[PDB]
Amino acid sequence: ANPYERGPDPTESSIEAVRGPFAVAQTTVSRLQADGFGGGTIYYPTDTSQGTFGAVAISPGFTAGQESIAWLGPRIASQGFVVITIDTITRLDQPDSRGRQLQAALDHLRTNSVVRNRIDPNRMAVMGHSMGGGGALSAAANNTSLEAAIPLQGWHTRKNWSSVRTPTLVVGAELDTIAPVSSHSEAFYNSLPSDLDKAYMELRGASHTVSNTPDTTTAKYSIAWLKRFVDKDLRYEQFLCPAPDDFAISEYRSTCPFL
């Protein structure tokens, strides 16, 4: 058996859920307490009876606060993850700095008494929007032990990601004019190793700012990806392979099967 499985057997509806199977609580990390990032909020399951959980750090993009990604916090954590949504040190931080801050936010979780006994420190992931998604890729390139990476409309000047060894779901917005998929998202996907477990999911009609308010497609497939790779949870392969059928996805590419 897989000792990392948490929660009831899934369905498409369970991964679409705004509130997942786990009740969640939250704790604030002040800027002063946050070594190497701008503070944040940690969302976590309060039920400890199924074991420890993997951890996820999420960064906003250029000019943006934690509030632009906050909705992902409880929506993902309630599926069985400890999730920290960060503020960056400054609103103008670039992608590589954001990648350092994502790693610093994960590292913080190991030290914070409210959650350190709730995490499996070996099973961690990074996500982010815009330059924060560039940051997620940078963090993965710097730490091949990360179990998943999910850039959402990622922006980066670095286009070649051949050194990444972390399963990566690249979420593009079809009509993105800030981080256009042809030169950002889908170029990143194409330069990830061909033998990596990876997928490219393009959101039909979406603008760059799609991740700044709730988007069910983004949440459901982020949850499925995190389950499949952070928890090695084979119950979630069904949602990723073969390609998802949602209208909201204009294009899907992957290295399925991952099994």
Author numbering: 2 to 260
Q: What does the study report here?
A:
Metagenome-derived polyester hydrolases, such as LCC and PHL7, have garnered significant attention due to their high activity at elevated temperatures of up to 70 °C. Their engineering led to the development of optimized variants, including LCCICCG, LCC-A2, Turbo-PETase, and PHL7mut3. , PHL7mut3 has been designed to improve the activity and thermostability of PHL7 by the Q175E, L210T, and D233 K mutations.
The E_PHL7mut3 crystal belonged to the C2 space group, while the P_PHL7mut3 and P_PHL7mut3_ng crystals belonged to the P212121 space group. Structure determination revealed that P_PHL7mut3 and P_PHL7mut3_ng crystallized with one molecule per asymmetric unit, whereas E_PHL7mut3 contained two molecules in the asymmetric unit. Very weak density indicates multiple conformations of K233 beyond the Cγ-atom in these two structures. We therefore consider the observed flexibility of K233 in the other two structures as characteristic for the enzyme in solution. The difference in the catalytic properties of E_PHL7mut3 and P_PHL7mut3_ng might be caused by the N143Q, N144Q, and N161Q mutations.
